[PDB]
């Protein structure tokens, strides 16, 4: 009903440093739409609810994506544009705190547990199927899809890593940190928009709309 194979397929189908980061974010919103279209039963929801889910979860989804991407590197983040932001660059641009939070609470833990792409895709699908999203035409259907995602995820974990009985819960317990970090990053984005001395592209700007 919610096979982890299709979720993994969705992940593999989509393959001032603050300015570069904003460029990469705008580039990856377009890609996020396609990714979400490849998640089972997402396209079958009402279009308004698809809009609501993506607008509620885009920042967390993209943060998870590049945090997992940056496993291969140390003290840095790999942007989807093929550009590397070093910890020192971020600190010298005045955004060292949130960057260190990303490296410490997300990237290094993903690397410590060797979180694979299937698990990343399942966590992102859980984030996508956020039943607390305000305005959902039917939050019960979204809740059910979320339950199916984490059922399949727990099954995959107990089959692939039978020696780690706590791996499922450890995967789920990174979601609070992802939520906090996403909120903080959104705050930074709104400050950049208000200040208006940082170029924000059209899709990112639309995500900043009311």
């Amino acid at each position: 009903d919610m096979p982890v194979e299709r979720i993994l397929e969705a992940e593999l189908a989509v393959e001032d440093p603050v300015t570069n980061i904003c460029q990469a974010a705008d580039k990856q919103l377009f890609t996020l739409v396609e990714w979400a279209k490849r998640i089972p039963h997402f396209s079958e929801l009402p279009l308004d609810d698809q809009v609501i889910l993506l607008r509620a979860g885009w920042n967390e989804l993209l943060i998870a994506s590049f945090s997992h991407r940056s496993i291969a590197v140390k003290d840095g983040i790999l942007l989807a544009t093929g550009l590397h932001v070093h910890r020192n660059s971020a600190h010298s641009a005045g955004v060292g705190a949130i960057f260190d939070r990303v490296l410490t609470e997300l990237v290094s833990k993903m690397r410590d547990m060797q979180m694979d792409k299937t698990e990343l895709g399942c966590l992102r699908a859980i984030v996508l199927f956020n039943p607390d999203s305000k305005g959902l035409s039917n939050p019960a259907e979204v809740e059910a899809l979320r339950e199916k995602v984490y059922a399949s995820l727990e099954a995959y974990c107990k089959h692939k890593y039978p020696e780690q009985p706590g791996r499922f819960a450890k995967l789920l317990l990174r979601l609070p940190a992802l939520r906090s970090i996403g909120l903080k990053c959104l705050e930074h984005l709104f400050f950049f928009k208000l200040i208006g001395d940082t170029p924000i592209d059209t899709f990112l700007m639309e995500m900043l709309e009311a």
Partner: peptide, 10 residues
């Protein structure tokens, strides 16, 4: 939300 709607419909 023009852009998101257009991308979701196609």
């Amino acid at each position: 939300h023009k852009i998101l709607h257009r991308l979701l419909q196609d």
